[PDB]
Amino acid sequence: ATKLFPKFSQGLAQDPTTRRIWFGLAVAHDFESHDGMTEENLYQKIFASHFGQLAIIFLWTSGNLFHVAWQGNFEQWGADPIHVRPIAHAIWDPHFGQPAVEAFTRGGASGPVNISTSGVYQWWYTIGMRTNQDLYVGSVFLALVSAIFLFASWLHLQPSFTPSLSWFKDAESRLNHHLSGLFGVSSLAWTGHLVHVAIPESRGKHVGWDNFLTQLPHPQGLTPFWTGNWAAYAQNPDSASHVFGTSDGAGEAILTFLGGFHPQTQSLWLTDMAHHHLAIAVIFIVAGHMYRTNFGIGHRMSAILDAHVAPSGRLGAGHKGLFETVNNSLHFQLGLALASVGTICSLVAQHMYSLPPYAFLANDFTTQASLYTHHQYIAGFIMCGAFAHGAIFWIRDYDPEQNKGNVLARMLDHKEAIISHLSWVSLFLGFHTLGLYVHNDVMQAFGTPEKQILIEPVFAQWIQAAHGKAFYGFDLLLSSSSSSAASASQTLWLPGWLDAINNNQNSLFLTIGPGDFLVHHAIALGLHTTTLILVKGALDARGSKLMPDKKDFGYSFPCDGPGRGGTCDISAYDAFYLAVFWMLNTIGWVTFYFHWKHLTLWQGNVSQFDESSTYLMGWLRDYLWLNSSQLINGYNPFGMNSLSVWAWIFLFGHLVYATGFMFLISWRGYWQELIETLVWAHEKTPLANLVYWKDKPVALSIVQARLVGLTHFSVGYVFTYAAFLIASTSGK
């Protein structure tokens, strides 16, 4: 009879098959579809759900601090961060054999433990933490914060504390508060930590909760700030002879603009990081005082959007009629948020390898590699969600009559132009980028390396020379001291930026060769193609010659039948499903280029990359095959070492990846009929016929199997690489 599992979906609740259990977990956080859903209730539910996610994040962080403190080597690693290996947690495996118990005792422990690649150690050291107590206190604090958010999820869901839809649609104020309070007052507050705790701790001086109200951050005090002589805070910077966590070479500056990196830590200076947060905090607070609130002075967002219509009428009604579109659509906003967060997630990876922001971060190669790959992959999934929710906006929440002539409606007008032009660029990048790899491979095979085509990335080399790179010899801007920009900065960060950029032992603007030219264009191909797939699905989300009523069929529908030749994978969910593969392929190439460019940098054999990368055969034998030699030997017929888990995961990843294929290659039908035979056998089998199924066994849904196979496929690509990226970098 009817079940209760799918409370939100009565159809699933009445479903006699097992699909009700599977879909009940999927259609669970799609409230917009829940039976009896009001816009205000939807916002209130989402608002509370946000608190829940914030409780998990803080609880997750507290756990890391707790395990690092209870089962870690922080104090030992802090004493010698270039020899001690940060310990993440202990391995209590009731299955471990004695050799496993021995081999996994590393980083200075009395039992099997796991070295950490998250880089929390380097970060917590740089910010002021020095003992295990600092970690315990922080974990308790964050745990309390998690408890508070959890109560708030309850409080904001109980009548009288449930915000009205109007409050949820109060944009002008929300943006003002978030920009000034959430972004600004949280950056100045951070400068307050740095100036008061981090900088003193780096100069060897405990300024904790016991003596912070009595310890002057600057010798002069707030006097220079009040007198306006702000410069006093930028005098006596820490000398190059300074040692992090020691008064050796320690200076007195609190806010400066030295640039480059501390000599010993090889990471951005703290003072330069203090002044950064102070400067950005000021901008955020002032920017917060822009939109109108309940006082008067201010800007109404609607007016700005409507007042921006090109007089030539090239953009039609311009942004007029767009404020309601964004304010009344929670998919449009989510798409913009995912796009913004995704892009910034990549900036963190591209700016944290070049400029290590934490002490002794560069030294830890395995951490650096596993942190770049983490963010670059997370960023890619976020970007797929951006376009995904954008397509949902086109169908679930787009009013074609209100948006009439607006920049958003004149996009579908030239939808073919946008889609077709993205096709030409993808083909051009594909036909050529690959052709100049096969051409080089042929020359390598025929022993004619000189004949291989090696185009020079001159355009990038000039942007490098502009920043001050001299190797190329172009004498442009910063490269030329007699310049205006070079002379202007000569008294600020310039003296340092050059010293650091013109040092080949780090990753600030690394020398690029013709090998980088090909891979960079290959990355572009992935960016354009993945984009084309998502863009095509978004534009054709509610329209198409094959399926002109796609909006009536919703977002996630298997197909429109075998009619009109084939409607297989015609839903805008299947532009996402397919784009995911290209996203993984694109990120795969970028995280493989990072790893090789850097493994060759760290091993000292830069010529290895500068030559093998030119042809694809080098990428496989010199990179994947050569580095995999150790990982695969984690456990052999002669014994096992500490890399056994990674070898096991490496194979485990392949298994999950291959399993994903069956759900994608095979389709619903052979399995369904097979399940029918299984149902017959059980009903006929004696002693087993007694036990029976409450839900009728049915094969996975057409769309369901698409996501199940894709999850297996993705999980594999992640575990298989995470294993390589960590066991090949650590093994050396």
Partner 1 sequence: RPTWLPNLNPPAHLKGEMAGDFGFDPLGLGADPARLKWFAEAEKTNGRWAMMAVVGILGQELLGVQPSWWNAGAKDYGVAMGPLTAMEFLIMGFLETKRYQGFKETGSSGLINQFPFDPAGMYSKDMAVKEVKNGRLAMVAFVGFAVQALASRTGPIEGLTKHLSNPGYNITYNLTHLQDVNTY
Partner 2 sequence: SHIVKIYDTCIGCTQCVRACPLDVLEMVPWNGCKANQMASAPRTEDCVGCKRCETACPTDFLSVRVYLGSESTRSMGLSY
Partner 3 sequence: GRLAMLAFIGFCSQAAVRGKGPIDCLKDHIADPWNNNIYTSSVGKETCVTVALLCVWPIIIEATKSLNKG
Ligand X SMILES: CC1=C(/C=C/C(C)=C/C=C/C(C)=C/C=C/C=C(C)/C=C/C=C(C)/C=C/C2=C(C)CCCC2(C)C)C(C)(C)CCC1
Interface positions with partner 3 (CB under 8 A): 154, 158, 160
Return the DSSP state at 700.
P
Nearer to ligand X, 141 or 472 (CB): 141
Q: What's at 712, amino acid-wise?
A: H
Short-list 269, 247, 244, CA closest to 77: 244
- Pick one of Ca ion, partner 3, ligand CLA, none as the site partner of residue 183 (Cβ within 5 to 8 A by kind): ligand CLA
Site residues, partner 1 (CB under 8 A): 160, 213-216, 219-223, 226-227, 294
DSSP class per residue in 303-316: HHHHT---TT-TTT
Distance separating alpha carbons of residues 4 and 259, to the nearest angstrom: 62
Distance, in Å, from the CA atom of 14 to the CA atom of 1, rounded to the nearest integer, reads 7
Segment interacting with Ca ion, rule: CB under 5 A, options 130-138, 221-229, 285-293, 709-717: 130-138
Q: Which stretch binds ligand CLA (CB under 6 A): 193-201, 454-462, 491-499, 570-578?
A: 570-578
Region from 255-263, 300-308, 615-623, 693-701 binding partner 2, contact rule CB under 8 A: 693-701
- 36, 282, 283, 299 from 289: Cα distances, Å: 39, 11, 10, 10
CA distance 27 to 414: 34
Q: Is 685 in the site for partner 2 (CB under 8 A)?
A: no
The verdict on 124 binding ligand X (CB under 6 A) reads yes
Q: Give CA 365 to chain center in angstroms.
A: 19
Closest distance to ligand X from the beta carbon of 37 (Å): 33
CA distance 129 to 245: 10
Q: Which of 516, 560, 611, 622 binds partner 2 (CB under 8 A)?
A: 560
Q: Which does 130 bind (CB under 5 to 8 A by kind): partner 3, ligand CLA, Ca ion, none?
A: Ca ion
b/e map 290-323, b = 16+ CB within 10 Å: ebeeeeeeeeebbeebbeebeeeeeebbbbbbbb
Q: And the tokens for 12?
A: 């699933």
Cβ at position 429, least distance to ligand CLA in Å: 6
Residue count of the chain, please give it. 732
Structure tokens at 150: 């959890």
Residue 127 vs 533, nearer CB to Ca ion? 127
Select the binding partner of residue 555 from ligand CLA, partner 1, ligand X, none (C-beta < 5 to 8 A, by kind): ligand CLA
Q: For 540-615, where are the alpha helices, taking DSSP H only?
A: 573-603, 606-612
What does 382 bind: Ca ion, ligand CLA, partner 2, none (CB cut-off 5 to 8 Å by kind)? ligand CLA
Residue whose CB is less far from partner 2, 373 or 571: 571
CB 615 within 8 A of CB 437: yes
569 binds, among ligand CLA, ligand X, partner 1, none (CB under 5 to 8 A by kind): none
**Whether the Cβ atoms of residue 320 and residue 305 lie closer than 8 Å to each other:** yes
Which of partner 1, ligand SF4, partner 2, none does residue 214 bind to, with CB < 5 to 8 Å depending on kind?
partner 1
Q: Is residue 61 involved in binding ligand X (CB under 6 A)? A: yes
Question: HEC string of 237-285?
Answer: CCCCCCCCCCCCCCCCCCCCCCCCCCCCCCCCCHHHHHHHHHHHHHHHH
Compute the least distance from the CB of residue 10 to partner 2, in Å. Answer: 9
Q: Is the dihedral of CA 526, 532, 533, 538 positive or negative?
A: positive
Q: Choose from ligand X, partner 3, partner 1, none: what does 158 bind? Cβ within 5-8 Å by kind.
A: partner 3
Which 303-322 positions form the footprint of partner 2 (CB under 8 A)?
none
Q: Are 126 and 270 in contact (CB under 8 A)?
A: yes
Stretch of 39-47, 238-246, 431-439, 553-561 contacting ligand SF4, by CB under 6 A: 553-561
Q: Which does 466 bind (CB under 5 to 8 A by kind): Ca ion, partner 2, ligand CLA, none?
A: none
Taking residue 547's Cβ as centre, other Cβ atoms within 10 Å add up to: 19
Which lies closer to partner 1 via its Cβ, residue 160 or residue 482?
A: 160
Question: What three-state secondary structure class fits 202?
Answer: helix
Question: Per CB under 6 A, does 664 bind ligand SF4?
Answer: no
Nearest approach in angstroms of CB 41 to partner 3 is 17
Q: Which is nearer to partner 1, 252 or 499 (CB)?
A: 252
Alpha helices (H) along 84-185: 98-103, 120-126, 132-155, 165-168, 171-177
Give CA torsion, residues 15, 21, 27, 31, to 10 deg.
Answer: 80
Residue given tokens 């010993």 in the structure block: 264
**Shortest reach from residue 560's CB to ligand SF4, in Å:** 7
Q: Are the beta carbons of 443 and 451 closer than 8 angstroms?
A: yes
Show the 3-state SS of 46-73: HHHHHHHHHHHHHHHHHHHHHHHHHCCC
Among 8, 96, 141, 183, binds ligand X (CB under 6 A): 141
What is the per-residue burial (b if ≥16 Cβ within 10 Å, else e) of 330-344? bbbebbeebbeebee
The yes or no reply on residue 533 touching ligand CLA (CB under 6 A) is yes
Task: Please report whether residue 571 would count as binding ligand CLA according to CB under 6 A.
Answer: no
Nearest to 382 by CA among 235, 596, 580: 580
Told to check if 30 binds ligand CLA by CB under 6 A, we report yes
Interacting residues with ligand CLA between 146 and 185 (CB under 6 A): 167-168, 170, 173-174, 177-178, 181-183
Enter the DSSP assignment of 694. Answer: S
- Nearest-10 Cα torsion for 132, 134, 136, 138: -150
Closest approach, Cβ 281 to partner 2, in A, equals 53
Binding mask 385-404 for ligand CLA (x = CB under 6 A): x--x---x------------
Q: Which of 265, 452, 556, 612 binds ligand CLA (CB under 6 A)?
A: 556
Joined tokens for residue 98? 């004695």
Residue 178 touches Ca ion, criterion: CB under 5 A: no
What is the x/- site pattern for Ca ion, positions 192-231, by CB under 5 A?
--------------x-x-----------------------
Contact letters for ligand CLA, residues 695-714 (x by CB under 6 A): ------------x---x---
With binding defined as CB under 6 A, does residue 562 bind ligand SF4? yes
Question: Is residue 565 part of the contact set for ligand SF4 (CB under 6 A)?
Answer: no
Distance CA 513, CA 473 (A): 14
Which residue type sits at 160?
Answer: S
Instruction: Name the binder of 3 from partner 2, Ca ion, ligand SF4, none, CB < 5-8 A by kind.
Output: none
Per CB under 6 A, residues contacting ligand X are 61, 65, 124, 138, 141-142, 213, 282
Per CB under 6 A, residues contacting ligand CLA are 26, 28-30, 47, 50-51, 54, 167-168, 170, 173-174, 177-178, 181-183, 186, 338, 381-382, 384-385, 388, 392, 420, 423-424, 426-427, 429-431, 434, 525, 529, 532-533, 555-556, 573, 576, 578, 581-582, 707, 711
Per CB under 6 A, residues contacting ligand SF4 are 558-559, 561-562, 566-568, 667, 702
